[PDB]
């Protein structure tokens with residue numbers, strides 16, 4: 001064993017009975033996803049993030065338990081500066097909690113949208129975050145794991161804006177390697193075409209990272225129901241068809257972006273976004289191209 005086993009009452013005590021008010025207004029709520037809500041807490045003077053798993057999407061209790069077990073297994077095997085650190089968990093009763101080191105700058109998604117009044121990320125910080133995220137994915141792939149849910153909401157940022165990959169509940173270990181599933185899971189706006197069908201491959205993680213690189217350049221979320229186009233990957237088509245340029249989509253909330261490094265990041269993203277999985281570069285090549293960029 002490597003993680004502290006908490007009793008559920010202890011985590012109820014340290015999160016102020018899972019206070020639903022936002023942290024910005026003195027509550028404990030930091031965010032939510034399809035598989036749970038994240039609360040801020042204090043455990044023995046340590047600031048923690050407590051993910052209470054109770055489902056808000058179409059998932060069964062046994063599927064939640066499988067994702068909880070999967071997260072613990074991946075966390076026990078993978079430790080890296082660009083991966084979040086699991087401190088412990090609670091499993092007593094019908095409730096499941098995962099306890100982590102708190103992330104002072106929350107998620108990349110929230111920082112790109114300046115949620116809660118945080119200042120816009122400079123181009124220089126965006127480049128370092130992209131490099132950190134690729135190093136995290138590279139470590140996971142080297143250790144034969146496929147993330148299956150890479151998105152900006154799953155890239156967290158510490159006090160220094162060091163990128164940290166999170167949410168390993170859907171991660172798959174692969175010794176051999178394309179395989180199939182009957183339960184399609186993930187965020188549609190980021191998912192590779194084959195992943196949307198049910199294929200499981202490390203090449204899908206590359207496609208999803210390409211979408212993240214477009215959110216970093218543009219400051220636009222991957223999907224926006226009230227936007228034209230609603231899907232960010234459609235801008236790649238508009239740019240490829242010469243109807244627009246990447247310069248027309250650069251986030252206006254920054255003053256330090258230069259055309260050379262922006263075009264270089266866009267080139268990495270377009271390569272990641274090849275329709276044909278085998279045309280996409282491997283994570284070590286993505287890592288190398290992002291290093292050449294700076």
Ligand SMILES: CC(C)Nc1cc(Nc2nc3ccnn3cc2F)ncc1C(=O)NC[C@@H](F)C(C)(C)O
Pocket residue numbers: 023030031032038049051084085100101102103104105106107110116118156166167
């Ligand atoms: C729930 C996500 C969006 N927000 C966090 C996750 C985390 N920690 C973790 N959360 C999760 C959720 C799943 N894995 N995971 C790993 C983690 F280490 N820590 C802090 C925040 C958080 O919101 N911090 C506050 C800052 F954004 C501030 C600017 C001051 O509002």
